[PDB]
């Protein structure tokens, strides 16, 4: 017989191995596959589809369907932003319920860009100008209009285009950022301000709503498969 | 075999890849532990905010390693493993919390009261981290004002380099059941390059 040698590692079962085992059913005719439309290849492709961000997670409005309707009120020109979203995936409760967030709860690292969309749902005739602004990592979330107005920002026109897109880049220190709340490494800050104010024709409801959608970009990737399932 | 001439050495390289500069420092190490909270109580000490100046100088592991050289350039990656728990011995409850972590570029206004304008910052980058998901991550590239970070600066005007400041607070309002949270910060210097090699600091820091 061929002179062999059992090295350390034999008689051990690796839960993440890749060996070939005896097939318990010889010649079983397997029903062939068909093109059922919607084949998926990788998880990072589910994130490439926008999901609606639950902006309002307040006491009464959290868990109800109103956790998506961002209401532009009939209040003054208070520079306090009309919405500030912390672009810190796990260190901020809001971005963790999105599809894009769900996939990021199955890994430890993430790289690439994330894009924000804002579909305005206001009485056709109604107009105005809002200022969607982003403040790069580390820098404190902009509190006054002018402040935000100096960082990366788009002055989105209600009257002209209904849907507003703003792609937040990948201005990161390391090559891979965290998905854990060890430290609050404040990434970006998607911030929306009243540039002008809303102008309404005749007597159309003075408080209409907006929706926000977040998704991954083609350059978005993840690593180190970890998980957390409970009982 | 047993040979002692006086050549140069003997042969040519024999593979040294994992000892290269990039792989020497390619290991993230804790740099600090920032403790926050959401006090319904007026604890003007921990008062939500916690600010830490980004300095390697605090932890030893990363320090000695960086001291083996005099100059360096390094794209800095930060990771934020955020963990929480309730303080008081009570069956009190809470909804998942969202923490805002702010990176502030070197030479900016450092936030004090968790309140103040400097927390809105039209410019300073921030990261809203919802709890219970993969830790947050941002990469701040070589933010030196010079052509390299001076590990040991000789001369006069210690503010070594200034890699910025991190501020973390809870975004949610005052919950009846007070929640403490520790923000661990990890720093993997990437694309690192170094210059003049000094002898290693032997002693205690």
């Amino acid at each position, epitope marked *: 017989g061929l002179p062999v040698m059992n090295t350390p590692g034999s008689n051990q079962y690796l839960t993440a191995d890749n060996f070939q085992s005896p097939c318990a059913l010889p010649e079983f005719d397997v029903t062939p596959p068909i093109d059922i439309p919607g084949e998926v290849k990788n998880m990072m492709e589910l994130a490439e589809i926008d999901t609606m961000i639950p902006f309002d997670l307040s006491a009464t409005k959290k868990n109800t369907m109103e956790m998506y309707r961002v209401r532009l*009120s009939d209040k003054p020109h208070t520079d306090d932003p009309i919405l500030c979203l912390s672009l810190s995936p796990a260190s901020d409760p809001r971005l963790s319920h999105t599809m894009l967030g769900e996939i990021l709860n199955y890994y430890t690292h993430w790289a690439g860009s994330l894009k924000f969309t804002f579909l305005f749902c206001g009485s056709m005739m109604a107009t105005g100008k809002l200022l969607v602004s982003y403040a790069p990592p580390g820098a404190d979330p902009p509190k006054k209009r002018k402040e935000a107005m100096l960082g990366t920002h788009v002055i989105w026109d209600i009257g002209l285009q209904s849907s507003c897109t703003m792609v937040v880049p990948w201005i990161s220190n390391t090559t891979y950022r965290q998905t854990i709340d060890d430290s609050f490494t404040e990434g970006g800050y998607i911030s929306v301000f009243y540039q002008t104010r809303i102008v309404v024709p005749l007597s159309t409801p003075r408080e209409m709503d907006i929706l926000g959608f977040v998704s991954a970009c083609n350059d978005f990737s993840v690593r180190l498969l970890r998980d957390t399932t409970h009982i | 075999p047993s040979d002692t001439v006086q050549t140069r050495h003997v042969v040519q390289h024999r593979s040294r890849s994992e000892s290269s500069i990039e792989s020497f420092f390619a290991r993230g190490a804790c740099v600090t532990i920032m403790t926050v909270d959401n006090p319904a109580s007026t604890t003007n000490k921990d008062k939500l905010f916690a600010v830490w100046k980004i300095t390697y100088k605090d932890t030893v592991q990363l320090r000695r390693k960086l001291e083996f050289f005099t100059y360096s350039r390094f794209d800095m990656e930060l990771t934020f493993v955020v963990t929480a728990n309730f303080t008081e011995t009570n069956n009190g409850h809470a909804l998942n919390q969202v923490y805002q972590i702010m990176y502030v570029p070197p030479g900016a206004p450092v936030p004090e009261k968790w309140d103040d304008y400097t927390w809105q910052t039209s410019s300073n980058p921030s990261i809203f981290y919802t709890y219970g998901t993969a830790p947050a991550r941002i990469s701040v590239p070589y933010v030196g004002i010079s052509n390299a970070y001076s590990h040991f600066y000789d001369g006069f005007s210690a503010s070594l380099n200034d890699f910025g400041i991190l501020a973390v607070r809870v975004v*949610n309002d005052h919950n009846p059941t007070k929640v403490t949270s520790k923000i661990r910060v990890y720093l993997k210097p990437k694309h690192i390059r170094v210059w003049c090699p000094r002898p290693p600091r032997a002693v205690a820091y």
Partner: nanobody
Amino acid sequence: QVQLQESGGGLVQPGGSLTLSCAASGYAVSRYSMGWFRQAPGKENEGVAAIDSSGVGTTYADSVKGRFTISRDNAKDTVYLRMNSLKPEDTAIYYCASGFGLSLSRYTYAYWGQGTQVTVSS
């Protein structure tokens, strides 16, 4: 999981000067601004008071202003809202939240309080 326990909520009578308090779990106060919102009976939520303990930047509502005082601790990590000269309209259910922020706005907030009603009725 960040916990904000809303305590100090009880029945006062037109001119009351009660105080509310909330602790900070999972994070350091200065990392998040801190605020309050009231659900007026049968009404939408209104911003009341909000400051970030980092450098303490005070901001109040139009009605609320002057009377109420928002203060923050960094040692016990608590927010103390001294609700002075409470009036009949101020008969609402308060909630403490951490923002970014640094003030009154329906959204812009992360973790929310459970619930507490300060009834301003003689």
